[PDB]
Design a protein around this nucleic acid. Sequence first.
RNA 1: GCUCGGGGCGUGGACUGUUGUCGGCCGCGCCGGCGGCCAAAGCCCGGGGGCUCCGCGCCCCCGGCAGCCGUCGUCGGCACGGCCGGUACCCGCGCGCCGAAAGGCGUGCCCCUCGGGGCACUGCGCUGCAACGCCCUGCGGGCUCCCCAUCCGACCCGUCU
RNA 2: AAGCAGAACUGGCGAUGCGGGAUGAACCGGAAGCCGGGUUACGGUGCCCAACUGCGCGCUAACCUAGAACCCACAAAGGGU
RNA 3: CAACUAGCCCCGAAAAUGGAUGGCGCUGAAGCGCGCGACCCACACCCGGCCAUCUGGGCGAGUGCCAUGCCCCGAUGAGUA
Lengths: 134, 219, 49, 133, 48, 206, 167, 111
Amino acid sequence: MPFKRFVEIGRVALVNYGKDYGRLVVIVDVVDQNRALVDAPDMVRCQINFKRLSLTDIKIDIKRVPKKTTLIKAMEEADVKNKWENSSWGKKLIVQKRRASLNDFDRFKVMLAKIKRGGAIRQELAKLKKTAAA
Amino acid sequence: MAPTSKMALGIKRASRSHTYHRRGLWAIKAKHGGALPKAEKPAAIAEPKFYPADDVKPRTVSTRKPHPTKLRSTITPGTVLILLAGRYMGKRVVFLKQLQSGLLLITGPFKINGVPIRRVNQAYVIATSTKVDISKVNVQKFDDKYFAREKKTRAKKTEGELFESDKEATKNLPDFKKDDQKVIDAELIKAIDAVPDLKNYLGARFSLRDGDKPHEMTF
Amino acid sequence: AEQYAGEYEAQDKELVQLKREARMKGGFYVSPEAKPLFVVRIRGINAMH
Amino acid sequence: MAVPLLTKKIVKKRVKQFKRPHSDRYIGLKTSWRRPKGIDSRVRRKFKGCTLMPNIGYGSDKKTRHYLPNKFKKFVVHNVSELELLMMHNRTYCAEIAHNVSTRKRKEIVERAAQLDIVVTNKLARLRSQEDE
Amino acid sequence: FKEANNFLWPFKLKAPLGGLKKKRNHYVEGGDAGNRENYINQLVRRMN
Amino acid sequence: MVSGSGVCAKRVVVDARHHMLGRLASIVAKELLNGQRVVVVRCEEICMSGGLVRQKMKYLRFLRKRMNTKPSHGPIHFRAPAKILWRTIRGMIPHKTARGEAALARLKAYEGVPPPYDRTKRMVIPDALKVLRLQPGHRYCLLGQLSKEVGWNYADTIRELEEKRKEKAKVSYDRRKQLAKLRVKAEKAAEEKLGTQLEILAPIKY
Amino acid sequence: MGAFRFHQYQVVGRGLPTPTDEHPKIYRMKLWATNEVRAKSKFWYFLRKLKKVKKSNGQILAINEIFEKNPTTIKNYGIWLRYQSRTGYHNMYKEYRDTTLNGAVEQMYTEMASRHRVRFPCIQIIKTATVHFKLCKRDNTKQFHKSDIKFPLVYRKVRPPTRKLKT
Amino acid sequence: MKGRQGQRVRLYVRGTILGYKRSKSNQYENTSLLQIEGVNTKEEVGWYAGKRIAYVYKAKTKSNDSTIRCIWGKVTRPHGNSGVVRAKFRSNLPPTSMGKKVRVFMYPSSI
RNA sequence: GCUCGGGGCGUGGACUGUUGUCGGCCGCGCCGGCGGCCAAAGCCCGGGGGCUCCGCGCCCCCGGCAGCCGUCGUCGGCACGGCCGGUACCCGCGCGCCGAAAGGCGUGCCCCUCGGGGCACUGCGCUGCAACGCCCUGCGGGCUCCCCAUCCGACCCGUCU
RNA sequence: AAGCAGAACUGGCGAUGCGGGAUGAACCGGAAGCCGGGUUACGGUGCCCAACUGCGCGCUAACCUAGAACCCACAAAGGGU
RNA sequence: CAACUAGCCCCGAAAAUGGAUGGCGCUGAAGCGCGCGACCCACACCCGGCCAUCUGGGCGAGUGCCAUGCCCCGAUGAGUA
């Protein structure tokens, strides 16, 4: 399936390589089933060839005429959703970054501790099922 | 490039100062230099050869320089270290001081975790973001000369005597070091317990799981 | 070397802007070359006249 | 000077060992190197794996030439008179007792050699000649 | 200063880092060979 | 991106379900050389892209070349999907050396499912015919549609294949339901233990 | 584009001849090149083939680059294009939708490579002239953007998105 | 014991010796190519330069009263896009080791 | 006064293998600056035009502007490692003082005139530093065959050609 | 017509391995002391087989021979809604 | 709607020991054309160590003697008849 293709402004996309390596973008103008003109609010625009970049579920409502500034206004109106997106809602990459930066002494010590508390929960639950069984 | 620039575009600015200080005395080692020293009555053969003297002096200074800076990445006294090599490797330990040898004094408190006083190399170590406060610890007693491991000269005693085989060639525990270690360790424990759960953490060990990347892991 | 380019920066003004949207060029002024060369041998002595 | 040159010679080795081609399957054809005269030999054409040929470049450092691995220069010593020449060198030269010399005459060579302090291999050769493993 | 040429006699350049452009073509066709002022200095700074 | 499937410290079980025959064979062969112990399961259900006609004729001409001027002693064609797969790996791997013979011996082919491997076999990073295709991309032809036209081993296999799938399907679903249920009450039981602080940092580490 | 793609070069020159009151001027066909290396040879060749001057009597004043024309967005480069196949050079007029001059080269180069089988000894173009979205006349690529730029038809076939998957 | 801590028997991140440095035609055993497990890219394998390598093996014979023997080495520089690395050893590793796991330590740490 | 041995004290030397380091050579990844290419994408403000003539919108140009860009050139900074060697006559360097240490400590001159900088000013002597094992108990090792790995294997050589 | 017979120029083989062309005396790359370390050529990078199942943009669906690297292991007139 | 242009695929294209893009196999290729990076890679190239040969030095004033010696150079080294 050669990603989402269309004729319309406003569909958000998520990285599968570019430069940038973070970045979420919206398609401001549309130019065949490969190329797209992508921009993001405080970030430099590029019209770029993307056989292998795929577009996410969430769409933001924006119109024709795309400055740099117009995009920012739409982002302010939206906002909110972006926070959720990182964890779960299409993207998943941004939350994955956090895992890597979490093996750093204090962070690692805390991380191991979470699992230990979880260990106890599994035992407690298992007892309830076990009594019912036998 | 940046440290070496002063010397490079000077040539011998430091070494110029020393001659002029000597000359501040008046008139001196120009005259003394020709007269100065020994020679003429040889040994063995030609005596074509080598050292003591002159040569030793720059070499000792140069070997001192890697001990901070080059090896170090940056590390202040009381940084928590990971020993990646050495015997005690995988233990997280607290940094007491840097020796003249360039090896590091460390000590994990003996009771909680097995690490003794010990010398370890700087090169092995990963510098972690944690610091434990070594404000009022007497690290002073332990020095470079403190760490001489006795050789298998003879018996440990005064010398000149017929001896017995019950020496420790590659090892030696002085009794004095064991007494001293307890005192220094006591102060460290106070700092360690101040931040919670650090005490258990040191003994546990860090190692890289399958799928873990040492490059991404960097503390 | 830099002042040669700076001289033509000052004098010329017809070269740069419009000409991308057109072909040919007009007049004004010309920068000379005067260059020795360096020659490095890419290809061996095998199989050549 | 002398010491790193010794290290280079002993550790590196061009103990390639120059075996004649088809020495393995013809017994009478000698182990000793002789140069393939014919064009048709692969060894002549310098194919690798066919046993590389002796050349000067394989050669060791000039100082380390004809030296025992101790860094002593080996000299086969026939009799007592020749020991006096070795005495001048001491460290540099070694004494090794000749094949021709019989057991009684070996003993006088050893005791004199001890005085020179060129004990190495001289004593060892003699000890076997007595009776010893 | 054609006698401030009067060279050593060969500069023994290194083989280029990042390699050559193909040997079988001239400069125009994406080969290396022949005249080019800009890209000769680039090449010589690989041949350090 | 990063390959989640391939060489593993210990964890090599390979799904062949709707994989590409030669794509799978190539990567599996590399793993065998690397010293991994690869168990390919669902061997008959692997697909070869292209129209039936050109896939079939490839094997058909090989059968003719096996067929005549006869001793025995070598020229051979495999009738079975499992042994066609084995032959493919025996073309990838140097089949003229003891190391490659050993690597070949670390390959196992199981049809349907082995006696219960209750760990699922999981897909190799985009190996599959299904996805690599936009849907279509013309036809594909199964090994099990090729091998029925070549003779026995498939003919006995096909009846047996069905039976294994039905039995394991039932059990696998029922354990899934109970396993899922544990997680539902887990979040309630993380609150219940007074509360938690460290563990609510954990969904920020998804 | 990054690590070029083949920038079109606004190549400046003369036609250096004799201390006489006459002189030819420079003439240009605007050529895609890699930098200086590709540019110099074709610059001589255009003059030499058409009019003849020489190569030594061809003088290169400067080479000047290109900076963003079309502001990233789309405008319809009218190209007349010559491809060498089985004989000499054959006509083509492709007027297409494109980003900018880098990309414009790419789109023509791939069409030549595939269809007409083409490498460097084929020549470039004849002229490049942009035109407006409604005005541009031929077909395929241009139509999809044309219908969007004056809208009402932005809002047509918006249904493939989420339905690429299933919904 | 001393040098002992609180768990991980596997002290190292894993690696594999695929082969030696090679053409299609020939090998040079002097340099060995190791593909290091979990190392996807050229950038990541750049970390591994300077690290110590051990090939630990067991043998029928005892030595200094131990059947376990080891050959040590060091990582020289990276090789290729896939996270392969170049390595030298004090004495060359046995080429039967093609397809074996070998151990790449953290031991001298640049970080 | 010396020498052999013993007594008494201090320094620590025995093949070979290992690890730390200084210097040289080479690779390695990453970060930063300036200029070129009238500089301008760019954004806010302002003005006019075209196209669209269904209007949004699209385009184009010009003046003020955070801004950051692809390519060319150059300089600047880091972080690591391989290999070789330990520099055996001018490579490097010490010779008064303090400072575990590294390191710094004269003076004049001039630029900066702040922080600091550059620039001048004596002669001799001389080229390897830290550590571990053991030398004997015991053992590193060398060499041959074999097995496994790997490879040119144009059949082995000669001759004719 | 010929891997043919005979000239002209030049390079090779003969006097040439090594690397490449699966394999090949002559083609391609390059002339070769002995080694360590670096870096390339030719040619490659799915696996064999050292090395991107790398990115980009097209084309191809081949039941009467799918296609796949100069020399080179052949191939054409002519036909296809 | 018609006539063309030229890509790949199809036809034209039929041989004998069974068979060869070298093999396996490969269909958003691992195919075919092409671009862009990264990367792989000869006894080649570089740097260092080292051998002989050649070249240029140098050091005998005797009383350690190879002075056809010793020591410093740098470049070079395939090799049949």
